[PDB]
Amino acid sequence: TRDQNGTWEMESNENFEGYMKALDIDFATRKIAVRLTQTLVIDQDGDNFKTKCTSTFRNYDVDFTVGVEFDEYTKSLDNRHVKALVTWEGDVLVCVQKGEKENRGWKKWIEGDKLYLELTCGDQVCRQVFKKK
Ligand SMILES: *C/C=C(C)/C=C/C=C(C)/C=C/C1=C(C)CCCC1(C)C
């Protein structure tokens, strides 16, 4: 399914530290981020996504339309300008963030009752799994 709608509660979060370090997120921020439970709320209407990440610390939204390139300034993350593009490869939603970091972006897909999110930057891969609330 391409339907990724839902309130998704983080079940596991593998190598978030390595991914954040590849992005040059500061030590103290990584230390806090790595311990927090994330909730990811996805509102998906056709090609339009409104994505909201929440934790007890930082909360972060990003909206995009599938197949429409968009500039991002990754404020409150690594503070870089990237050109972002989110497209479908089969039932995998693929984001590429073109810019300074190589292999930067993510892949997101549904398997059964779970949402999988693989974040990449440089040689690092972070694997997150969420379950619907
Ligand atoms: C569809 C899935 C999306 C848009 C995933 C977005 C992921 C984030 C906004 C992640 C944010 C963070 C980090 C990369 C590290 C610092 C802590 C967070 C949660 C602000």
UniProtKB/Swiss-Prot annotation:
Q: Which UniProt keywords apply?
A: Cytoplasm, Retinol-binding, Transport, Vitamin A
Q: What is its main location?
A: cytoplasm
Q: Which domain of life does the UniProt lineage start with?
A: Eukaryota
Query: Which GO BP annotation is one of this protein's?
Result: fatty acid transport
Which Pfam families does UniProt cross-reference here? Lipocalin (PF00061)
Q: Does the keyword Cytoplasm apply?
A: yes
Q: In which tissues is it expressed?
A: Higher expression in adult small intestine and to a much lesser extent in fetal kidney.
Gene Ontology CC terms: cytosol; nucleus
Which residues are listed for all-trans-retinol binding in this entry? 40, 108
Where is the protein found, in the record's own terms?
Cytoplasm
Q: Name one GO molecular function term.
A: retinal binding
The record's family statement is: Belongs to the calycin superfamily. Fatty-acid binding protein (FABP) family.
Q: What is known of its domains?
A: Forms a beta-barrel structure that accommodates hydrophobic ligands in its interior.
**What is the protein's known function?**
Intracellular transport of retinol.
Q: What is this protein called?
A: Retinol-binding protein 2
Q: Which organism is it from?
A: Homo sapiens
